[PDB]
């Protein structure tokens, strides 16, 4: 294992080798202005990571920095992008853990993996841990027919997430998790997550800025009204608009006949095809040919959940 | 784990000795214009894996290649053939996954296999992964009797499939094949851009199938293809070929070739190589095997692709 | 290993290295007057740990001191705080063992670490063992998906915790859970105190707010009686979250997302003295909801009102 | 280590000392072959299997080769170690008693040496019988749930090792857990039934030969009131009847004083008929009709009776 700041070291003797390897295997040029919308989550990340890095003498006592956040939303919007954005625009080390890192064949190895992960993230830096797809780890705790090992993992998260019984040693940790199904988390894990936030499907102006964002670098015409393109995609997610943009970018290639031109007269026409601009007809043909990943029941259930038990 | 292009080698020090054998066990020719009809899948495959091979300089930035496709439809309609065709037509490595290979005994000995497979497919040449019958692997997550060994495969697919995106090592294209497309997730179908439904029947293409299959050197008087193509009602893409095999065995079964051993074997065999087939054994084959296909599956798939299909 | 009182020493020769290391790994100055309410468990701790040091000639025969106590209630009411307070106020040695320090991949360690734990806790001092979240450790024995190598741990607790008329050394066993009806029917008999902990009512949350807000400058616009009257059904942790989010809302009154570096370190000193007015609570009361609706609380109340030993 | 008949000597200089100590430790009360109630067929096959070649060794030359392996299957308490101990008494063969704790083998590749040295030592003493009790242990599947990569080697060494004559007996309570290559290799698979209403009368009238019975001669009635007793329990019924003769006179109150002639007044007391009525209301059979029918179905699907 590498050393940390101020030349210290970790004495990892009491664990076996492959546990250390399996946690060691879970360790730029983006920006936090590349996230359209989401003001409050940017506010919490502003006042929980970037502000204690500058002025730590303000955040002590009752104004302790937060130690929890869970993002609950429908599965289209950007919940992974915000985590990678905060991973790039920081100076703190990042730990991504998915549901297949906490897995082994022997008995009682998941627990020691979680223990080693939390101690290492405490040792290295004021770090940040991203446990994506949290619902595959913490379900309920007394449901019908869960194995006798996942319940120990839930117990380990519960006993480790609060702690640091010494009032000193303000070595900060900030745990971040994203899920689709927030009505299936155990209650003793749910109150450990302060700042449970809802994320919506984007509004009109968010979609307008999305199409403004996605179409840069590629030349477009000057007859494109973005307003009708906003007003017709009522119900699209934040992930289908980029797919619509990609289909409207490749429809100009499907408009000409390159499937017929085989081998010959292929490399000679591709050099002048790159300058052909993108007109309104490609957007109309892509818009007729792309339908959203619909089913608005799930957005309804998730928003009613986070309006009942949520804390912004 | 032999090798790859440019003489490099893999370092699989992280896994056991039985897991890597299960993925190594998952790795003839065919022609592209054998597959008749279905121009849309040809379009998507041509703008997906064909044109990025010769011209990598056009596909950069916004013009990134695709990474997913789903073929919905009735069973036995030519999906494995398109898989083999796009395998052999290019210089790509070809993996194949069913539901019967992602199963082992120990808990957590299935999830390393999927991550190992995806690490190999990024490690090798630009490749094609054919995951067949995902209606059993991916159900719904919030089911009633969903095991605690089935959710983690879905979670591993969702985390691995969309992976940290700047100019990757090689493109990898995953296919799909499913008879029941309404029973799929809401987070897995989003990773599958370009979902498309393909139908079974035709009249003129079934005629072209007969003209591409009935390669019998006899039967110069069995040219009844209008009625033979009008009698293909509800017959899937395998049904006409099985009918042709039935007719070609009923050539030597309509004539008494039973118990011709010792007496009159070679002359009865050599006067039969030019023996004229007619509508007799064809009529025997017509009323022998009825199609076991129901229209409810086709109607519900055509209803499902109407709402949530991005052609 | 450490020494003990009177300079003796344990003889761990029949055990391997990592066993005594893993029990070695489980071995400020807050007072007990920070806990709001909860008189009954304070009474039992007073007459069970505090008093047998002062007058030891009293607790002699039928008045033998207690041996076990399970706290049960809805999550987030103050269970681990009483344990840490008793650890910091007494003079005993303190073991915090939880259900991850009892497992190893070898055969025969899940039952030995428990025995070495109890033998060291008897060897040292009038000690206190604090097993946290025992619902994972002790389930029902005759159950469906029970692995074999947990029955050894259940039998080891079930034998060890009641063992002549000699050996006047004391060990007190404290345990907390929030699903008590999944305890085995033979392990609930060992725990002879099964108190229930309630949610705070309308006379306790006022005192909890008044304890939590001292140390930060405030105004006198605040009506604590209304703030207790609207915050109904909350946890303790939600009350502390409310009292924190009010101050962070006071940070949000100065829009600091625009400024970056230029006199920013000198900007917050104008904010570091600002008062906390009533609009801050009037925003935080709709900013925060409770943690979980009442369905576990009624199950624990119907459980401890039939099988509970107050 | 002793010699054998005709002064031959085994050259056991090729192994360690604790191995030969273990296999010698696995090597007299004369019981009777007619001291067991029921089961005439197994007595017939034992008579053909070990006694008849001693008398007439010319009959067993060609196609009449004597049997070489055998297994009894049935419920617990039908006396499957009783036939083994009886035939160990009333024979001239050198008996052996192997077990699963006799194959502990803390090292690696040492159980294999123990089994091979056992079978080579068995071919030294010429008439030999090997008695493997409860072959369920070491007799699981070769790809089962709980197995190392070492016990499979034990099973394979046992299968090749079985090829100067010996004869192996064995028994189980759970027959269906057995293998296939181990099952086909054993030539004779025999079910053992529970005693019927006729054998029980002989069993209870035979066991009660020391104590004086007077008039409880309704042995047909005593065999009719016990429906499904499991053989090893009616002896417990007679034992409980004797202790019920003891319990009638209150002797828990006497402490030393005159407690020696008080037993002399009870050492001459006879077993009356009141003891059996209090004896039937205090003993129930150990099993329900569950394992017996399963053993019957397994012996009907594989038993060459």
């Amino acid at each position: 294992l590498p050393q940390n700041s101020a030349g210290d070291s970790f004495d990892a003797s009491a664990y076996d080798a492959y546990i250390v390897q399996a946690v060691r295997g879970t360790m730029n040029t983006m920006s936090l202005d590349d996230i359209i919308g989401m003001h409050d989550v940017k506010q919490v990340l502003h006042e929980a990571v970037t502000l204690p890095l500058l002025v730590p003498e303000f955040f002590q006592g009752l104004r302790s920095p937060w130690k929890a956040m869970v993002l609950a939303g429908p599965p289209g919007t950007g919940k992974t992008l915000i985590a990678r954005a905060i991973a790039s625009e920081s100076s703190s080390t990042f730990f991504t853990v998915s549901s297949t890192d906490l897995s082994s064949k022997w008995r009682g190895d998941s627990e020691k993996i979680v223990r080693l992960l939390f101690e290492l993230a405490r040792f290295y830096a004021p770090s940040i841990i991203f446990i994506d797809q949290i619902d595959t780890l913490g379900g309920q705790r007394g449901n019908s027919g869960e194995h006798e090992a996942s319940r120990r993992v839930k117990s380990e998260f519960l006993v480790q997430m609060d702690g640091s019984q010494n009032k000193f040693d303000s070595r900060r940790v900030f745990v971040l998790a994203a899920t689709n199904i927030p009505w299936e988390l155990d209650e003793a894990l749910r109150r450990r997550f302060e700042k449970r936030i809802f994320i919506p499907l984007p509004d009109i102006d968010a979609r307008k800025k999305l199409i403004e964002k996605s179409m840069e670098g590629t030349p477009k015409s000057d007859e494109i009204n973005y307003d009708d393109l906003a007003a017709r995609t009522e119900g699209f997610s934040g992930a289908d608009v980029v797919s619509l943009c990609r289909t409207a970018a490749i429809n100009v290639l499907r408009r000409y006949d390159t499937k017929s031109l085989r081998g010959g007269e292929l490399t000679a026409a591709m050099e002048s095809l790159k300058a052909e601009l993108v007109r309104n007809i490609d957007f109309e043909a892509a818009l007729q040919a792309v339908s959203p990943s619909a089913g608005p029941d799930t957005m309804l259930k998730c928003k009613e959940w986070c309006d009942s038990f949520g804390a912004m | 784990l032999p090798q790859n292009s440019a003489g490099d080698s893999f370092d699989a020090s992280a896994y056991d000795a039985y897991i890597v054998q299960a993925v190594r066990g998952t790795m003839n020719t065919m022609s592209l214009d054998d597959i008749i009809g279905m121009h849309d899948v040809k379009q998507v495959l041509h703008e997906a894996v064909t044109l990025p091979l010769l011209v990598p300089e056009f596909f950069q930035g916004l013009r990134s290649p695709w990474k997913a496709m789903v073929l919905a439809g009735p069973p036995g309609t030519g999906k494995t053939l398109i898989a083999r065709a796009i395998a052999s037509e290019s210089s790509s490595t070809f993996f194949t996954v069913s539901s019967t290979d992602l199963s082992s005994k120990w808990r957590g000995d299935s999830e390393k296999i999927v991550r190992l497979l995806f690490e190999l497919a990024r490690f090798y040449a630009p490749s094609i992964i054919f995951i067949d019958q995902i209606d059993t692997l991916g159900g719904q997550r919030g089911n009633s009797g969903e095991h605690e060994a089935s959710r983690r495969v879905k979670s591993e697919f969702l985390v691995q499939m969309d992976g940290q995106n700047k100019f990757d090592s090689r493109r990898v294209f995953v296919l799909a094949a499913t008879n029941i497309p309404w029973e799929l997730d809401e987070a897995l179908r989003r990773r599958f851009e370009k979902r498309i439904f393909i139908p079974l029947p035709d009249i003129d293409a079934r005629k072209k199938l007969i003209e591409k299959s009935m390669e019998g050197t006899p039967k110069s008087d069995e040219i009844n293809y209008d009625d033979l193509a009008a009698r293909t009602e509800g017959f899937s893409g395998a049904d006409v070929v099985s009918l042709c095999r039935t007719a070609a065995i009923n050539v030597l079964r309509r004539y008494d070739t039973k118990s011709l051993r010792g007496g009159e074997l070679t002359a009865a065999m050599e006067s039969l190589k030019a023996e004229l087939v007619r509508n007799i054994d064809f009529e025997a084959a017509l009323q022998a095997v009825s199609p076991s296909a129901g229209p409810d599956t086709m109607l519900k798939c055509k209803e499902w692709c109407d709402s949530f299909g991005a052609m | 290993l450490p020494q003990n009182s009177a300079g003796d020493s344990f003889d761990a020769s029949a055990y391997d290295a990592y066993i005594v290391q893993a029990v070695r790994g489980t071995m400020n100055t807050m007072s007990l007057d920070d806990i709001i309410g909860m008189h009954d468990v304070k009474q039992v701790l007073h007459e069970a740990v505090t008093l047998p040091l002062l007058v030891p000639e009293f607790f002699q025969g039928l008045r033998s001191p207690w041996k076990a106590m399970v706290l049960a209630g809805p999550p987030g009411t103050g269970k681990t705080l009483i344990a840490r307070a008793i650890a910091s106020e007494s003079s005993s040695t303190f073991f915090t063992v939880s259900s991850t320090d009892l497992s190893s991949k070898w055969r025969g360690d899940s039952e030995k670490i428990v025995r070495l734990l109890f033998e060291l806790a008897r060897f040292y001092a009038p000690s206190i063992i604090f097993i946290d979240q025992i619902d994972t450790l002790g389930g029902q024995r005759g159950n469906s998906g029970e692995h074999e190598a947990s029955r050894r741990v259940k039998s080891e607790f079930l034998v060890q915790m009641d063992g002549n008329k000699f050996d006047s050394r004391r060990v007190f066993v404290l345990a907390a859970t929030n699903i008590p009806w999944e305890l085995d029917e033979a392990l609930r008999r060992r725990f002879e105190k099964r108190i229930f902990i309630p949610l705070p009512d309308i006379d306790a949350r006022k005192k909890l707010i008044e304890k939590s807000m001292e140390g930060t400058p405030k105004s006198d616009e605040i009506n604590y009686d209304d703030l207790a009257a609207r915050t109904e059904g909350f946890s303790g942790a939600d009350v502390v979250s409310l009292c924190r989010t009010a101050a962070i809302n006071v940070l949000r009154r100065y829009d600091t997302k625009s400024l970056r570096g230029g006199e920013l370190t000198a900007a917050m000193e104008s904010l570091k003295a600002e008062l906390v007015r009533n609009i801050d609570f009037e925003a935080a009361l709709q900013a925060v909801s409770p943690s979980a609706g009442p369905d576990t609380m009624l199950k624990c109340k119907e459980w401890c009102d039939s099988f509970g030993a107050m | 280590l002793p010699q054998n008949s005709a002064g031959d000597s085994f050259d056991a200089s090729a192994y360690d000392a604790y191995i030969v100590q273990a296999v010698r430790g696995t090597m007299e009360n004369t019981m009777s072959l007619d001291d067991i109630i029921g089961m005439h067929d197994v007595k017939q096959v034992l008579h053909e299997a070990v006694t008849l070649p001693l008398l007439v060794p010319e009959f067993f030359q060609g196609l009449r080769s004597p049997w070489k392996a055998m297994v009894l299957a049935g419920p617990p308490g039908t006396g499957k170690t009783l036939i083994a101990r009886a035939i160990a008494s009333e024979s001239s063969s050198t008996f052996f008693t192997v077990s699963s704790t006799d194959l502990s083998s803390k090292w690696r590749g040492d159980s294999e040496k123990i089994v091979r040295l056992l079978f080579e030592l068995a071919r030294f003493y010429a008439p030999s019988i090997i008695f493997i009790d409860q072959i369920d242990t070491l007799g699981g599947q070769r790809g089962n749930s709980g197995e190392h990569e070492a016990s499979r080697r034990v099973k394979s060494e046992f299968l090749v090792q079985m090829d100067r004559r010996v004869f192996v007996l064995a028994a189980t309570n759970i027959p269906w857990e057995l293998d296939e290559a181990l099952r086909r290799r054993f030539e004779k698979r025999i079910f053992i039934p529970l005693p019927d209403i006729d054998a029980r009368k002989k069993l209870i009238e035979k066991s009660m030969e020391g104590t004086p019975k007077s008039d409880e001669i309704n042995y047909d009635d005593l065999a009719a009131r016990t429906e499904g007793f499991s053989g090893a329990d009616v002896v417990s019924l007679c034992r409980t009847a004797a202790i019920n003769v003891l319990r009638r006179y209150d002797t828990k109150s006497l402490r030393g004083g005159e407690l020696t002639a008080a037993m002399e007044s009870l050492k001459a007391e006879l077993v009356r008929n009141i003891d059996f009525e209090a004896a039937l209301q205090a003993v129930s059979p150990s099993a329900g009709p569950d394992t017996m029918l399963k053993c019957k179905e397994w012996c009907d699907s594989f038993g060459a009776m």
Binding site: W106, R107 | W106, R107 | - | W107
Partner: peptide, 12 residues
Amino acid sequence: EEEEEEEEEEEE
């Protein structure tokens, strides 16, 4: 010499 240890695995 060579010795032998024992393991414990779980399965579903």
